Amino acid sequence: KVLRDNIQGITKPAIRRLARRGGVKRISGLIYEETRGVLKVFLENVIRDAVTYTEHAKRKTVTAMDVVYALKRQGRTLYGFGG
Amino acid sequence: KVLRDNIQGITKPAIRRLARRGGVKRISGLIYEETRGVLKVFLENVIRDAVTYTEHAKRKTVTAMDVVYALKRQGRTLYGFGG
Amino acid sequence: ARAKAKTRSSRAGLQFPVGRVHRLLRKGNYSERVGAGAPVYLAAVLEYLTAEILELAGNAARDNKKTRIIPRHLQLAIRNDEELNKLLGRVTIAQGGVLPNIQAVLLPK
Amino acid sequence: ARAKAKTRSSRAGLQFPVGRVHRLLRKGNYSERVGAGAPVYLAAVLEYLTAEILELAGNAARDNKKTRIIPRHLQLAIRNDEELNKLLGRVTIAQGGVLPNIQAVLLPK
Amino acid sequence: KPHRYRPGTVALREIRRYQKSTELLIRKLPFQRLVREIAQDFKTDLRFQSSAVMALQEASEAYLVGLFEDTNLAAIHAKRVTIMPKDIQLARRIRGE
Amino acid sequence: KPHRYRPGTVALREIRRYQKSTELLIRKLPFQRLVREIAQDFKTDLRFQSSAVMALQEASEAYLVGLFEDTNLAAIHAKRVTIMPKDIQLARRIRGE
Amino acid sequence: KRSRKESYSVYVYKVLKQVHPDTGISSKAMGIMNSFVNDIFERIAGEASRLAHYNKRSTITSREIQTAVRLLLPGELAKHAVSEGTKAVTKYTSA
Amino acid sequence: KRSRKESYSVYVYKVLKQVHPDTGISSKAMGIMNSFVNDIFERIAGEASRLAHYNKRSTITSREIQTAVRLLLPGELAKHAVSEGTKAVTKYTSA
DNA sequence: TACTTACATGACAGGATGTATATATCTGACACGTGCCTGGAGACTAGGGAGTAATCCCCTTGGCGGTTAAAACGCGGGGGACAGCGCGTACGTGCGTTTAAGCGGTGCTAGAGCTGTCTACGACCAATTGAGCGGCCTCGGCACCGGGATTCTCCAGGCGGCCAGTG
DNA sequence: CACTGGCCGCCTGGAGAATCCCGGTGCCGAGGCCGCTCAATTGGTCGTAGACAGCTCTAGCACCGCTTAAACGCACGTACGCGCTGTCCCCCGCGTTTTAACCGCCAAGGGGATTACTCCCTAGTCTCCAGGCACGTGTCAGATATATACATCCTGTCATGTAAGTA
């Protein structure tokens, strides 16, 4: 039930493929740690917003509606999920 | 009546003073014309918005209130002239 | 006893709704009142933008040798127009990926 | 026989108006109906932010041995405080200038 | 000797294939479990539709990938082909966090 | 021999002086001439409030000092101290425009 | 018994068939189009509301939304949308 | 006389005299405070309107407002704002 | 000294594989048909927002004379930028293994969401008043002015260490 | 081999100026007073939106069972960053000269702004009907799979520049 350390579940080759989509030539071995940290910070902000949205609506399930609202708040509005 | 060259009216030592406020120590010789151009671009973007506000207001005189509104539209909100 | 019902979009000669967009403005709380020509203008603007992006999507689908538009074709349509990137630079796309863009030193030799 | 006109900000123990904030919310066209807790809550958060920033401004002014606050002191007050800097990242203070923040590599040895 | 390419040619193929690609780059199950891991820290017993996990996922490659084009701009600015962490926090700090 | 300060020492004194300072770094009347020129490009016979010229002055100085901070970061990124057009274009490209 | 969901489905399908008769449309692309129409509509409506607020105007007019088209839509898209809107309100007024 | 141009003068002056009885205020700083109050009020009101639109709510009470505080104001300022706002609303219900 | 000849490096050729190029198959998501209703719409009405005439004044625009700091130009110089060589280095990629995500399957219920009640609650309007802003005046904190110290900066030649001559 | 004088790096002391520290003066900016006004407040009333209860049903949670793709880890290998240093060059510091910016002073009128008027318009509501949405299905573009062709990338092999021996 309770989890500790699943941030390693975003694997190193997942970060490699992400950077390949971004057009990266060479990814240093140091890079994966702060990419995980930046993803930690960004998802923390987004789900903090989304949890605040859901707790405003007095629900217990995070919907994609509140997700795209949280992305619209941050100036990263996403197309394709019913916003 | 017509004005053709006042972009050189933003003099090079005045650009130097602005870069001193920006913490720049060493400024290349090609920088000044580029700064003139990008300031021209930003003034173009601001003044098209401000004149659009003015012609919506049916006014001929540009006001600082429209300056505040055009700056806050671009995400560059300026304190000190509102109200 | 009553005039025949005629849609306002067909009165303006548009496909995009005068009525639905007008109602959504009235319930979207942007003002207390809305002028009559404002939803017609807004529907015309939305129809123009959608017509442009769907025309570019059909062009991309013909380039991709496909008949039905995919959000990859939509991302290809947006990012290959500079002024739409000036409109939609900060908006992220589902399943669109990235425009093909390999920089000059990134290419070999 | 009407009761004495006593004020809502004093009912909150606050100085920022419940009245002006409520009026600007109603005429700002943000919702059809507005709960009574909304403008008093908003006056409270504005008063806390105002108290915090004028605290830092007064401390900066006494640091610069001056009695009257100036937007130089305000701008200094804003970017010593990290969460205020996060709040006001895109905002420029008029006549505020920039707080001294020199990168160490360009400093002399 | 067995077949083996020079360094970066396979990276060229990877970049070209993955910019042509539209399918998902990160695994679904550990991403959903990571969202759950972060969520229980903020509110316990929190549930997600699959579509909300999809939307957070699309936002994740969106934000990350955009940071990598910013990182490539920084890296080619420093005349390098290998990216470094300071490229990432430099791009984040110029971006305005 | 007349006294002469080393190159950069007066530059650091300029940085400390103008960074401590709060006053305007552009002459107000050529800026007014320039803004009337660019205004006449879009709409003829435009008139400016003096406070409007001052507000555009503060906004222009603000955008320029922010971009100059960004180019300072780009220059110290590139193992250099002299800012270059490539640094300025790096800043403009990263900032999302 | 389900609840009706409002979308732009047949409208986008109609204009797509007008600009390209022989093409199709996917459901993911329709989600993209619904999000696009909603977002651009919201941007134009919000800036129109701000224009009405700044000039103390209590109503949304075609003139100020034309102002919003000048503001938001850049360059040739602005003037083409102006031509489209003026033509549209012209044949709407004549009807 | 001329028309009243409404401002945040006496309120900022009173909160100064609470927090620092001895220090003064300049007019440029005072305009900075006016634009500050306007900007923060606009941000909170816009996010409250957005939250009302999302939940299909015609009502803005303190609950949406504290939601918007927890969005916009980061961390420590947000929880403090909840603290004095909670004190204010409890004193308001107790009149 | 030029002619001949052997050697090392570059231009030309060729194979292997991976991704493009061609074609057969099935399948489910796109696309078409149907009932519906609810949401768009026509007419009338109550009412009120804004376009426009008039004006005024004030605040912006235009013009004129002097100072001198701002700007501009030149000399000099020191700092910066950057590429070649080398040097050590660190991921990229090939390939075998694991395992755990991925794909298909099943059971239950949390809670998401729709429906009925009702009530807390909020909005609107006449009166009223009381705090909050327009306008003015005062003095003293601060802008402007003047003189010596400390600090900053930069330079010479005093100091220490090292080296080589000499006894 | 030690002493010791000389030379060179370098390290310290000192000298001048630029802003800071300390007085000296005058001034209009804001803080407070006064007057006004308009706008918050109180009560009542009336309508109305969301909290709460209840139900239900559906997709998310939970558990189950195969399958190699992903992951990972090591190993060879090649390229990658970068420091030294040289080399070249380009812009800061400062002095001098010009010039228009700033001040400051005065005329004039364009339009920003305000008030009134009167009429254009626009939400609201009752009602009516009609096109998009829920729902169902059937069907061909694409997902998938199998057989070729070139790209292309790397690697071998002769072609050729070139250096050396020698008649």
Numbering used by the authors:
A (entry chain L), B (entry chain P): 20 to 102
C (entry chain Q), D (entry chain M): 10 to 118
E (entry chain K), F (entry chain O): 37 to 133
G (entry chain R), H (entry chain N): 30 to 124
Relevant lines from the article:
H1 contacts DNA with L1, the amino-terminal part of α2 together with L3, and α3 to stabilize the nucleosome and contribute to chromatin compaction.
In contrast, the presence of H1 on the stacked nucleosomes 1 and 3 differs between the four arrays. Particularly high Δβ values are found for entry DNA at nucleosome 3, except for the 4×207 array, which is the only array where H1 is observed on nucleosome 3. However, when Δβ was higher, H1 was not bound, likely because a stabilizing contact between loop L1 and linker DNA could not be formed.
